[PDB]
Design a binder for this molecule. Structure first.
Ligand code: HEM
Ligand code: CAM
Ligand code: K
Length: 405
C-alpha cells in the first residue's frame, strides 16, 4: 500500500522504495537497495511505502544525520511508525545525554573484555560445528552454522537455555523482518514476557551471565531499574540472534561463488581480518533511522517535525562517492569506508564480538572446507528489512577435498 503523499513533499522526490520487499530483491539485497544510488536518484527521497518516510541515499547525508541527534532523534528509530513508537530498547531508543550512561553497562556484558575472555569457547564451537559438517559434503548453511554458531555463543553469554532458541529467534525476526503475524508491539511484549521474570530471578539470585550483570548493574552510579534492565536485555537478545547470523550467510554465499577470493585467503590467511572488513562493507545489512524533532531544511529538502527518515547504514559503504567500484570485493582495498556498525553516538557495542565471530568462522571454515560451491541449480534468495538476510544457503563440496585438523 502507498500512503497518501503529505502536503509538504514534492512529487519530484517520490521514489516508492519498499524496505521490506524491495523491487530488485532477486538481484541480491544490497543490489536492491543500491537502486537508490543510481545517478538520477536524488540524495534524499520520499517513499510512500510502509506509511511514508524519507530515505537518505548517500553516505554523506547518512553520516551527517546520524551525528545530528538534535534534529534526528532515536526515540522512534524503526519504520513503520507503529514499530518505531513501540521500540523502547536501551540504549538505542534514547538520545544523548541520557543514552550514554547505559552504553558503559552494555559494554560490560558484550564489549572487548568479555569477547577477549570468550575467545576459547568461540574458537571451540566454530571448529566443532565445522568439523561435524566437513565429512558430509553438504550443508544448509543458514540453519547448520550461521544460526547456531553466533546464537549458541550468545545464549551461553546470557545464561539462557539452547532449547529456547526457536521461540526467541522467531520473536527477534518479527522485529526486523516481520512475517505479518505479529506487530512489533506484540513481538516486543512476548520478548518481555520471557525476560521480565528471568531478570527478577537474577536480581534475587545474581549469576555471572550477561542478564545478571545488566539486571544488577549501575548506571552512572545509581541502580538500574527492572524496566531499564528489561529494555537493555531485549536489545542484546536482538543483537545476538539477528545480526552476525545474517552477515555470515552473505559472506559464505560470496565465498562459495568466488573461488579466487577463497584461494586468496587460503594462500594468505593474514588477510582474513582485512577481508572481514571488506565483507562488512560489501555485505552491509542494517537499515534503521530517526525521527525529526522539528521542521528542518536538510540538503535543500523541507523535513517536517515528526517525519521519519530511514538512514540506511548499509548504503554508506556501497556509495561510489565513498568507495570506488563499490560492488567489487577487494581484500586489498586501502580505505574501506562504511557505516556497517552505525555512526554517531549509537555506534555498535557488539562489533568486537561480531568481528571475532566472523574472523574465526572464515579461518576455521577455510582450513577444513577450502573448496565449496552453491548446491546444483540453487538460486539464493535474500530477504530485506531492518536487518537483511539470506533465506537459505545450500552448499556442497567433495569431502575428499576437506581436511580434519
Ligand atoms: C554484523 C553484526 C552487527 C551489525 C552489522 C550491527 C549493527 C549495528 C548498528 C547499525 C547499530 C546502530 C543502530 C542505530 O544507530 O540505531 C548497532 C547498535 C548496537 N548493537 Fe550492533 N550490530 C552487530 C552485532 C551486534 C551484536 C552481536 C550485539 C550484541 C550481542 C550488538 C549490540 C548492539 C547494541 C547494544 C547497540 C546499541 C548501541 C547504542 O544504542 O548506544 N550488535 N549495531
Ligand atoms: C539496528 C540493530 C542492528 C541495532 C542492534 C540490533 C538492531 C536490530 C537494533 O534494534 C539496534
Ligand atoms: K519509541
Amino acid at each position: 500500500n502507498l500512503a497518501p503523499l503529505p502536503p509538504h513533499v514534492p512529487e519530484h522526490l517520490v521514489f516508492d522504495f519498499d524496505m521490506y520487499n524491495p523491487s530488485n530483491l532477486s538481484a541480491g539485497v544490497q543490489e536492491a537497495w543500491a537502486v537508490l544510488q543510481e545517478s538520477n536518484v536524488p540524495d534524499l527521497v520520499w517513499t510512500r511505502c510502509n506509511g511514508g518516510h524519507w530515505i537518505a541515499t548517500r553516505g554523506q547525508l547518512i553520516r551527517e544525520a546520524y551525528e545530528d541527534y538534535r534534529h534526528f532523534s532515536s526515540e522512534c528509530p524503526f519504520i513503520p511508525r507503529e514499530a518505531g513508537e513501540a521500540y523502547d530498547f536501551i540504549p538505542t531508543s534514547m538520545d544523548p545525554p541520557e543514552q550514554r550512561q547505559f552504553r558503559a553497562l552494555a559494554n560490560q556484558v558484550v564489549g572487548m573484555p568479555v569477547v577477549d575472555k570468550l575467545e576459547n569457547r568461540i574458537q571451540e564451537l566454530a571448529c566443532s560445528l565445522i568439523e561435524s559438517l566437513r565429512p558430509q559434503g553438504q550443508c544448509n548453511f543458514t540453519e547448520d552454522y550461521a544460526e547456531p554458531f553466533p546464537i549458541r555463543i550468545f545464549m551461553l553469554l546470557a545464561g539462557l537455555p539452547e532449547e529456547d532458541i526457536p521461540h526467541l529467534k522467531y520473536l527477534t525476526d518479527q522485529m526486523t523482518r516481520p512475517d505479518g503475524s505479529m506487530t512489533f508491539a506484540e513481538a516486543k511484549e512476548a520478548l518481555y514476557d520471557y525476560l521480565i521474570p528471568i531478570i527478577e530471578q537474577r536480581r534475587q539470585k545474581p549469576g555471572t551471565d550477561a542478564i545478571s550483570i545488566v539486571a544488577n548493574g549501575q548506571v552512572n552510579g545509581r541502580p538500574i531499574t527492572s524496566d531499564e534492565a528489561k529494555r537493555m536485555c531485549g536489545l542484546l537478545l536482538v543483537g545476538g540472534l539477528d545480526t552476525v547470523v545474517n552477515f555470515l550467510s552473505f559472506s559464505m554465499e560470496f565465498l562459495a561463488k568466488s573461488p579466487e577470493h577463497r584461494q586468496e585467503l587460503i594462500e594468505r590467511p593474514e588477510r582474513i581480518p582485512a577481508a572481514c572488513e571488506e565483507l562488512l562493507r560489501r555485505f552491509s545489512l542494517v537499515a534503521d533511522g530517526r525521527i525529526l524533532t522539528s521542521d528542518y531544511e536538510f540538503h535543500g529538502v523541507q523535513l517536517k517535525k515528526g517525519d521519519q527518515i530511514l538512514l540506511p547504514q548499509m548504503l554508506s559503504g556501497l556509495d561510489e562517492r565513498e568507495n570506488a567500484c563499490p560492488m567489487h570485493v577487494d581484500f586489498s582495498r586501502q580505505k574501506v569506508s562504511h557505516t556497517t556498525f552505525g555512526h554517531g553516538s549509537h555506534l555498535c557495542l557488539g562489533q568486537h564480538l561480531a568481528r571475532r565471530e566472523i574472523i574465526v568462522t572464515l579461518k576455521e571454515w577455510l582450513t577444513r572446507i577450502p573448496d565449496f560451491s552453491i548446491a546444483p541449480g540453487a538460486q539464493i534468495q535474500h530477504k530485506s528489512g531492518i536487518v537483511s538476510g539470506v533465506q537459505a544457503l545450500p552448499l556442497v563440496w567433495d569431502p575428499a577435498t576437506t581436511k580434519a585438523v
